[PDB]
Amino acid sequence: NIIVGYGEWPSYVNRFYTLDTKLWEKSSKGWYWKFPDVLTETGVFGQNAQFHYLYRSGFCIHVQCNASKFHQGALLVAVLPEYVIGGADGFELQHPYVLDAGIPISQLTVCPHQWINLRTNNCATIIVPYINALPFDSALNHCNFGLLVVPISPLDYDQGATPVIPITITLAPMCSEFA
Amino acid sequence: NIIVGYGEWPSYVNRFYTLDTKLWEKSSKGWYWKFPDVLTETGVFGQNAQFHYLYRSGFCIHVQCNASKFHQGALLVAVLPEYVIGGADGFELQHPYVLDAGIPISQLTVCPHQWINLRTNNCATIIVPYINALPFDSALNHCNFGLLVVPISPLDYDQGATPVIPITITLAPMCSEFA
Amino acid sequence: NIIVGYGEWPSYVNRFYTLDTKLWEKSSKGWYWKFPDVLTETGVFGQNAQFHYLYRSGFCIHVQCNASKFHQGALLVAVLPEYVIGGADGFELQHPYVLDAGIPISQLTVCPHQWINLRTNNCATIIVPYINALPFDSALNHCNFGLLVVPISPLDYDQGATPVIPITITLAPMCSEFA
Amino acid sequence: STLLGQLCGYYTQWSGSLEVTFMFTGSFMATGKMLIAYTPPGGPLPKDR
Amino acid sequence: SHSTAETTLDSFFSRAGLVGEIDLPLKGTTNPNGYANWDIDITGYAQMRRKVELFTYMRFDAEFTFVACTPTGEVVPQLLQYMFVPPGAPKPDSRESLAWQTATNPSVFVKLSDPPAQVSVPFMSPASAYQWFYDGNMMGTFSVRTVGTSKSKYPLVVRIYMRMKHVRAWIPRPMRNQNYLFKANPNYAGNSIKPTGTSRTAITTL
Amino acid sequence: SIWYQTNYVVPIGAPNTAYIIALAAAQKNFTMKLCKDA
């Protein structure tokens, strides 16, 4: 299903951007992306973000993964504003237990989140509004939030099945403004 | 679904005749049947066709095949009036590329046709009216059309699964007339 | 005053583009520009024209020159569609008598034209619609028309006055379309 | 190999819109994704996905 | 069943706690000149950081109380100044600095044999709220000295208490798991990561 | 052009290769002119 972050819709280049595919392995630890840095060298949005002095936008995020009925595992997808760590290809987690910031992963469900259980569903959709202490900001000096995709239950399969599961991220800006 | 040839229903012994089963192999090339020659020594229709001087009929054709969810392939079923080649068991194709007549197979979809994709469906139904330049004809000297079942995508499976897939043809005369 | 070419207004990036200034001398022969080639590496219009397959636009042209009351001379400004010769800085005329194409200059008033007499006025405005045998064309392979600024009466002054008179061209696209 | 090409080989000029259909004939338990792209006249082949 | 007014945000952050301690010795090298500059921060109270970092944005006012005495705990005849330097103004660098006599820096002259002084400071951020996390919070400064030209005849200690009022917060976060290493830094010791709680021998035994 | 977005995922017991068939046609605004012999 679709979850709307904090119960608020975005308000006052608007197309689908499909990123490169991640490969989920038996020993994967997790990945994260930062916004708007994920879209700053791709297309008209990236051209607009590097030539304007002020920026403001919301987002719509889809996470997908296709696997067979003989695979198993579970992922947690969450959005954390101002994710300070202690491009379009993302980064991997070194210590997923502390989320690389000294905070537990078990309480990450306090944020707008979704579950991907391979036996039940294979999609997750989150709608994020604009969050800041300022009406406008800079798209090249400040990252508003981060997206996390972490496996809570490890991927398992029998020998002879495909050993890597693809994860696809496609996102669309909503109510973007430039000045 | 059901397709009606040329958008016309048959107009002015009427039971189901189930033929012998064909075995689809990894190296199969295709089969064809000729009408009314396919039904001229089977039952009351065959007795009627060899003792009357004039004949006129339409047909309804069902093609079926049962396979598992671990098999793959695709067949094209088509009807070609006056299929000149350059019984109830059919004939095999020698050069399926030219349809044994010097004409390409890729344009065979210009005729009343259906697709059988093993991953999607396992049935095809075609209703054929009477086509001729004469109101009546001879059932023992003229074949009105031919039926073709050709694999466009080869049959594939893993070792240990069943290596032959059955194809069943059952047909019923419609609005048959004799004189 | 303002003249509208052939009595037609343009119909179905839209800002003022001021070009570099030409210097009118005692021995000047004349200059010409070609459209849309004059605007193909300047700004958003130039970016749009090199990345779209079809193009269609009209234009509005202003020609200016400031001189004192002790200078004299006269210029003819004219627009000639499909000006075949036998960037943003223009070209000079080698044989202005034949207009570099084998045709007399004395009949150039058959085209949309204006006169700049230094003793009377110092401005000329021409509005040009889209002229072609096709609804759309290519902005990088075809020049629709050319602009000519030719001195019919030579520039004269007394020694001690400024020996060069500036000519300024500023133009704005009208009803431009891209596809 | 198409009948449209053979038929337009009997004329000199033509113009209009086309449509292409892709049908997958794998097994029922196979999954994946593909990207099908169209590039307008005058453009080059994309270098990557 | 208890009341829901005990868990409001104005009850969680509701009391005056010690956030500062200024020492003005008669001899030594701690504050050789009889003055000191203290930058207003709320993490002087050791338990405040984990409590406030439960949220990303906060907005509040503050109330400050100054208690002064001798290291023994005695009360003596002395006068002090307590100047407030707003964010963006120069701070004193000597006892003869001209910053002590700038009228735009508010001051509170008071005696030691007096009830503790008390002032209110408003919300001073240029934005709509403070933030404890910035992926890419100056409140002021309190300067403490002894009034006079010559040095004081007593050793003094000044303690500062802060209470937050009119509290608002947005966007909760997971609570801190590991030991802190720096100020304004979520850094942690990567060679010694500890579980959130306690462990047991087997999953089937209580 | 057709690109691979993900990899080809398949369980154990199913074939590792598949085929795609392409079909082409024309829309209702297609026209031709000036017949010629081929």
PDB file of C-alpha atoms in Angstrom, chain B:
ATOM      1  CA  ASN B   1     -10.897 -16.318 -26.346  1.00  0.00           C
ATOM      2  CA  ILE B   2     -13.008 -17.195 -29.399  1.00  0.00           C
ATOM      3  CA  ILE B   3     -12.292 -15.675 -32.809  1.00  0.00           C
ATOM      4  CA  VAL B   4     -14.805 -15.770 -35.667  1.00  0.00           C
ATOM      5  CA  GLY B   5     -13.182 -16.032 -39.079  1.00  0.00           C
ATOM      6  CA  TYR B   6     -13.684 -12.947 -41.265  1.00  0.00           C
ATOM      7  CA  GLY B   7     -16.453 -11.790 -38.922  1.00  0.00           C
ATOM      8  CA  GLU B   8     -18.998 -14.248 -40.332  1.00  0.00           C
ATOM      9  CA  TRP B   9     -20.911 -17.029 -38.633  1.00  0.00           C
ATOM     10  CA  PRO B  10     -21.740 -20.307 -40.387  1.00  0.00           C
ATOM     11  CA  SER B  11     -25.169 -20.261 -42.014  1.00  0.00           C
ATOM     12  CA  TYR B  12     -27.380 -22.237 -44.387  1.00  0.00           C
ATOM     13  CA  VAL B  13     -23.433 -35.622 -37.256  1.00  0.00           C
ATOM     14  CA  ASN B  14     -23.313 -32.317 -35.362  1.00  0.00           C
ATOM     15  CA  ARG B  15     -21.286 -33.457 -32.357  1.00  0.00           C
ATOM     16  CA  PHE B  16     -17.720 -33.329 -31.039  1.00  0.00           C
ATOM     17  CA  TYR B  17     -14.989 -35.354 -32.745  1.00  0.00           C
ATOM     18  CA  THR B  18     -11.768 -35.635 -30.738  1.00  0.00           C
ATOM     19  CA  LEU B  19      -8.738 -36.608 -32.797  1.00  0.00           C
ATOM     20  CA  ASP B  20      -5.612 -38.506 -31.831  1.00  0.00           C
ATOM     21  CA  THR B  21      -3.094 -36.605 -29.711  1.00  0.00           C
ATOM     22  CA  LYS B  22       0.112 -35.112 -31.122  1.00  0.00           C
ATOM     23  CA  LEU B  23       3.333 -35.057 -29.095  1.00  0.00           C
ATOM     24  CA  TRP B  24       5.211 -31.746 -29.046  1.00  0.00           C
ATOM     25  CA  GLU B  25       8.972 -32.295 -28.841  1.00  0.00           C
ATOM     26  CA  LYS B  26      12.072 -30.129 -28.633  1.00  0.00           C
ATOM     27  CA  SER B  27      12.733 -30.701 -32.358  1.00  0.00           C
ATOM     28  CA  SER B  28       9.169 -30.512 -33.687  1.00  0.00           C
ATOM     29  CA  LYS B  29       8.612 -28.479 -36.848  1.00  0.00           C
ATOM     30  CA  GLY B  30       4.820 -28.296 -37.121  1.00  0.00           C
ATOM     31  CA  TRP B  31       1.742 -30.155 -38.354  1.00  0.00           C
ATOM     32  CA  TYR B  32      -1.203 -29.529 -40.642  1.00  0.00           C
ATOM     33  CA  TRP B  33      -4.616 -31.027 -41.398  1.00  0.00           C
ATOM     34  CA  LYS B  34      -6.933 -30.677 -44.396  1.00  0.00           C
ATOM     35  CA  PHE B  35     -10.719 -30.279 -44.354  1.00  0.00           C
ATOM     36  CA  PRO B  36     -13.062 -32.087 -44.914  1.00  0.00           C
ATOM     37  CA  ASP B  37     -10.519 -34.860 -45.517  1.00  0.00           C
ATOM     38  CA  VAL B  38      -9.809 -35.041 -41.771  1.00  0.00           C
ATOM     39  CA  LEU B  39     -13.409 -36.282 -41.271  1.00  0.00           C
ATOM     40  CA  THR B  40     -14.209 -38.664 -44.123  1.00  0.00           C
ATOM     41  CA  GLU B  41     -13.796 -42.105 -42.525  1.00  0.00           C
ATOM     42  CA  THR B  42     -14.993 -41.309 -38.975  1.00  0.00           C
ATOM     43  CA  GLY B  43     -18.617 -41.890 -38.087  1.00  0.00           C
ATOM     44  CA  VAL B  44     -21.846 -40.572 -39.533  1.00  0.00           C
ATOM     45  CA  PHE B  45     -20.209 -37.466 -41.020  1.00  0.00           C
ATOM     46  CA  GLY B  46     -17.789 -39.687 -42.923  1.00  0.00           C
ATOM     47  CA  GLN B  47     -20.576 -41.969 -44.109  1.00  0.00           C
ATOM     48  CA  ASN B  48     -22.619 -38.961 -45.275  1.00  0.00           C
ATOM     49  CA  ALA B  49     -19.660 -37.378 -47.095  1.00  0.00           C
ATOM     50  CA  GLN B  50     -18.849 -40.453 -49.222  1.00  0.00           C
ATOM     51  CA  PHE B  51     -22.420 -41.098 -50.400  1.00  0.00           C
ATOM     52  CA  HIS B  52     -23.713 -37.627 -51.343  1.00  0.00           C
ATOM     53  CA  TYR B  53     -22.906 -35.702 -54.503  1.00  0.00           C
ATOM     54  CA  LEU B  54     -22.862 -32.185 -52.984  1.00  0.00           C
ATOM     55  CA  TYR B  55     -21.674 -30.903 -49.605  1.00  0.00           C
ATOM     56  CA  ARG B  56     -21.538 -27.636 -47.646  1.00  0.00           C
ATOM     57  CA  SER B  57     -20.543 -26.986 -44.030  1.00  0.00           C
ATOM     58  CA  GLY B  58     -18.808 -24.798 -41.482  1.00  0.00           C
ATOM     59  CA  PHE B  59     -16.669 -25.821 -38.538  1.00  0.00           C
ATOM     60  CA  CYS B  60     -15.698 -25.035 -34.946  1.00  0.00           C
ATOM     61  CA  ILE B  61     -12.160 -25.961 -33.878  1.00  0.00           C
ATOM     62  CA  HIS B  62     -10.643 -26.271 -30.393  1.00  0.00           C
ATOM     63  CA  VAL B  63      -6.908 -26.759 -29.807  1.00  0.00           C
ATOM     64  CA  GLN B  64      -5.667 -27.705 -26.339  1.00  0.00           C
ATOM     65  CA  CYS B  65      -2.406 -28.604 -24.628  1.00  0.00           C
ATOM     66  CA  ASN B  66      -1.653 -29.325 -20.970  1.00  0.00           C
ATOM     67  CA  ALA B  67       1.808 -28.644 -19.541  1.00  0.00           C
ATOM     68  CA  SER B  68       3.262 -27.657 -16.187  1.00  0.00           C
ATOM     69  CA  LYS B  69       4.434 -24.249 -14.973  1.00  0.00           C
ATOM     70  CA  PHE B  70       8.081 -25.205 -15.601  1.00  0.00           C
ATOM     71  CA  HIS B  71       7.657 -25.629 -19.384  1.00  0.00           C
ATOM     72  CA  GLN B  72       7.898 -22.904 -22.011  1.00  0.00           C
ATOM     73  CA  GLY B  73       7.147 -22.311 -25.674  1.00  0.00           C
ATOM     74  CA  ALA B  74       4.617 -20.778 -28.029  1.00  0.00           C
ATOM     75  CA  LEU B  75       2.479 -22.070 -30.905  1.00  0.00           C
ATOM     76  CA  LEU B  76       0.649 -20.310 -33.736  1.00  0.00           C
ATOM     77  CA  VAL B  77      -2.673 -21.786 -34.900  1.00  0.00           C
ATOM     78  CA  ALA B  78      -4.031 -20.521 -38.219  1.00  0.00           C
ATOM     79  CA  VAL B  79      -6.507 -21.383 -40.982  1.00  0.00           C
ATOM     80  CA  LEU B  80      -5.590 -20.916 -44.661  1.00  0.00           C
ATOM     81  CA  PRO B  81      -8.219 -21.426 -47.399  1.00  0.00           C
ATOM     82  CA  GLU B  82      -7.022 -23.368 -50.458  1.00  0.00           C
ATOM     83  CA  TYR B  83      -3.710 -24.440 -48.930  1.00  0.00           C
ATOM     84  CA  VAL B  84      -1.920 -25.965 -51.919  1.00  0.00           C
ATOM     85  CA  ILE B  85       1.307 -27.739 -50.974  1.00  0.00           C
ATOM     86  CA  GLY B  86       4.378 -27.306 -53.155  1.00  0.00           C
ATOM     87  CA  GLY B  87      -6.121 -38.302 -43.093  1.00  0.00           C
ATOM     88  CA  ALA B  88      -7.156 -37.993 -39.458  1.00  0.00           C
ATOM     89  CA  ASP B  89      -3.522 -38.152 -38.294  1.00  0.00           C
ATOM     90  CA  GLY B  90      -2.220 -35.135 -40.210  1.00  0.00           C
ATOM     91  CA  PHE B  91       1.101 -34.370 -41.850  1.00  0.00           C
ATOM     92  CA  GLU B  92       4.330 -32.757 -40.694  1.00  0.00           C
ATOM     93  CA  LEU B  93       6.051 -29.711 -42.165  1.00  0.00           C
ATOM     94  CA  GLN B  94       9.361 -30.181 -43.976  1.00  0.00           C
ATOM     95  CA  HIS B  95      10.344 -26.499 -44.314  1.00  0.00           C
ATOM     96  CA  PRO B  96       8.191 -24.529 -41.850  1.00  0.00           C
ATOM     97  CA  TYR B  97       9.896 -21.246 -42.793  1.00  0.00           C
ATOM     98  CA  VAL B  98       8.246 -21.205 -46.231  1.00  0.00           C
ATOM     99  CA  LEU B  99       5.149 -23.097 -44.982  1.00  0.00           C
ATOM    100  CA  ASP B 100       5.955 -25.811 -47.563  1.00  0.00           C
ATOM    101  CA  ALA B 101       4.485 -23.546 -50.259  1.00  0.00           C
ATOM    102  CA  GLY B 102       6.977 -20.735 -50.921  1.00  0.00           C
ATOM    103  CA  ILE B 103       5.268 -18.155 -48.683  1.00  0.00           C
ATOM    104  CA  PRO B 104       6.682 -16.723 -45.428  1.00  0.00           C
ATOM    105  CA  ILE B 105       5.410 -17.868 -42.059  1.00  0.00           C
ATOM    106  CA  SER B 106       5.851 -14.382 -40.569  1.00  0.00           C
ATOM    107  CA  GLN B 107       2.826 -13.142 -42.550  1.00  0.00           C
ATOM    108  CA  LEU B 108       0.561 -16.058 -41.549  1.00  0.00           C
ATOM    109  CA  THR B 109      -1.176 -13.753 -39.048  1.00  0.00           C
ATOM    110  CA  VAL B 110      -3.101 -12.289 -42.016  1.00  0.00           C
ATOM    111  CA  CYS B 111      -5.406 -15.338 -41.600  1.00  0.00           C
ATOM    112  CA  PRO B 112      -7.766 -16.236 -38.730  1.00  0.00           C
ATOM    113  CA  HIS B 113      -5.228 -17.148 -36.072  1.00  0.00           C
ATOM    114  CA  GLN B 114      -4.611 -17.590 -32.351  1.00  0.00           C
ATOM    115  CA  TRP B 115      -1.547 -17.701 -30.101  1.00  0.00           C
ATOM    116  CA  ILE B 116      -0.868 -20.377 -27.478  1.00  0.00           C
ATOM    117  CA  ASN B 117       1.750 -19.140 -25.009  1.00  0.00           C
ATOM    118  CA  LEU B 118       2.448 -21.830 -22.417  1.00  0.00           C
ATOM    119  CA  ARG B 119       2.941 -19.219 -19.682  1.00  0.00           C
ATOM    120  CA  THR B 120      -0.389 -17.468 -20.387  1.00  0.00           C
ATOM    121  CA  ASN B 121      -3.056 -19.782 -21.865  1.00  0.00           C
ATOM    122  CA  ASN B 122      -3.502 -23.326 -23.147  1.00  0.00           C
ATOM    123  CA  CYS B 123      -6.460 -23.117 -25.544  1.00  0.00           C
ATOM    124  CA  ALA B 124      -7.476 -21.616 -28.884  1.00  0.00           C
ATOM    125  CA  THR B 125     -10.888 -21.569 -30.579  1.00  0.00           C
ATOM    126  CA  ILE B 126     -11.604 -20.607 -34.200  1.00  0.00           C
ATOM    127  CA  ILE B 127     -14.984 -20.619 -35.975  1.00  0.00           C
ATOM    128  CA  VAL B 128     -14.763 -21.045 -39.754  1.00  0.00           C
ATOM    129  CA  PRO B 129     -17.652 -20.447 -42.192  1.00  0.00           C
ATOM    130  CA  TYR B 130     -18.030 -22.029 -45.634  1.00  0.00           C
ATOM    131  CA  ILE B 131     -15.725 -20.416 -48.204  1.00  0.00           C
ATOM    132  CA  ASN B 132     -15.929 -21.234 -51.911  1.00  0.00           C
ATOM    133  CA  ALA B 133     -16.702 -19.731 -55.304  1.00  0.00           C
ATOM    134  CA  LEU B 134     -19.652 -22.142 -55.565  1.00  0.00           C
ATOM    135  CA  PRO B 135     -22.677 -22.704 -53.292  1.00  0.00           C
ATOM    136  CA  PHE B 136     -21.931 -26.443 -53.059  1.00  0.00           C
ATOM    137  CA  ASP B 137     -18.973 -28.678 -53.840  1.00  0.00           C
ATOM    138  CA  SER B 138     -17.650 -32.238 -53.584  1.00  0.00           C
ATOM    139  CA  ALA B 139     -16.384 -33.544 -50.246  1.00  0.00           C
ATOM    140  CA  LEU B 140     -14.130 -36.148 -51.889  1.00  0.00           C
ATOM    141  CA  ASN B 141     -12.425 -34.070 -54.610  1.00  0.00           C
ATOM    142  CA  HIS B 142     -11.788 -30.646 -53.041  1.00  0.00           C
ATOM    143  CA  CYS B 143     -10.235 -29.535 -49.747  1.00  0.00           C
ATOM    144  CA  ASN B 144     -11.618 -26.180 -48.651  1.00  0.00           C
ATOM    145  CA  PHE B 145      -8.924 -25.126 -46.164  1.00  0.00           C
ATOM    146  CA  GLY B 146      -6.095 -26.319 -43.965  1.00  0.00           C
ATOM    147  CA  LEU B 147      -5.286 -26.008 -40.275  1.00  0.00           C
ATOM    148  CA  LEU B 148      -1.737 -25.241 -39.132  1.00  0.00           C
ATOM    149  CA  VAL B 149      -0.163 -25.633 -35.682  1.00  0.00           C
ATOM    150  CA  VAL B 150       3.461 -24.445 -35.802  1.00  0.00           C
ATOM    151  CA  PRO B 151       5.835 -23.750 -32.862  1.00  0.00           C
ATOM    152  CA  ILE B 152       7.350 -20.283 -33.225  1.00  0.00           C
ATOM    153  CA  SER B 153       9.208 -20.547 -29.897  1.00  0.00           C
ATOM    154  CA  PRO B 154      10.828 -23.914 -29.107  1.00  0.00           C
ATOM    155  CA  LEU B 155       9.746 -26.127 -26.228  1.00  0.00           C
ATOM    156  CA  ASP B 156      12.156 -26.072 -23.290  1.00  0.00           C
ATOM    157  CA  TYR B 157      12.316 -27.801 -19.914  1.00  0.00           C
ATOM    158  CA  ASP B 158      14.802 -29.017 -17.324  1.00  0.00           C
ATOM    159  CA  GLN B 159      15.965 -32.626 -17.230  1.00  0.00           C
ATOM    160  CA  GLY B 160      13.627 -34.744 -15.120  1.00  0.00           C
ATOM    161  CA  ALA B 161      10.437 -33.074 -16.336  1.00  0.00           C
ATOM    162  CA  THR B 162       8.183 -34.619 -18.957  1.00  0.00           C
ATOM    163  CA  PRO B 163       9.886 -34.315 -22.378  1.00  0.00           C
ATOM    164  CA  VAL B 164       6.713 -34.435 -24.535  1.00  0.00           C
ATOM    165  CA  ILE B 165       3.696 -32.111 -24.388  1.00  0.00           C
ATOM    166  CA  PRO B 166       0.332 -33.329 -25.742  1.00  0.00           C
ATOM    167  CA  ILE B 167      -1.735 -31.343 -28.241  1.00  0.00           C
ATOM    168  CA  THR B 168      -5.417 -32.247 -28.626  1.00  0.00           C
ATOM    169  CA  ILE B 169      -7.766 -31.198 -31.443  1.00  0.00           C
ATOM    170  CA  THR B 170     -11.551 -31.482 -31.081  1.00  0.00           C
ATOM    171  CA  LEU B 171     -13.906 -30.164 -33.751  1.00  0.00           C
ATOM    172  CA  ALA B 172     -17.639 -29.964 -34.475  1.00  0.00           C
ATOM    173  CA  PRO B 173     -19.433 -29.404 -37.803  1.00  0.00           C
ATOM    174  CA  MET B 174     -21.767 -26.415 -37.954  1.00  0.00           C
ATOM    175  CA  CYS B 175     -24.716 -25.984 -40.339  1.00  0.00           C
ATOM    176  CA  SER B 176     -23.691 -28.936 -42.498  1.00  0.00           C
ATOM    177  CA  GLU B 177     -25.757 -29.648 -45.617  1.00  0.00           C
ATOM    178  CA  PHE B 178     -25.811 -32.634 -47.964  1.00  0.00           C
ATOM    179  CA  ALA B 179     -27.417 -33.282 -51.343  1.00  0.00           C
TER     180      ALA B 179
END
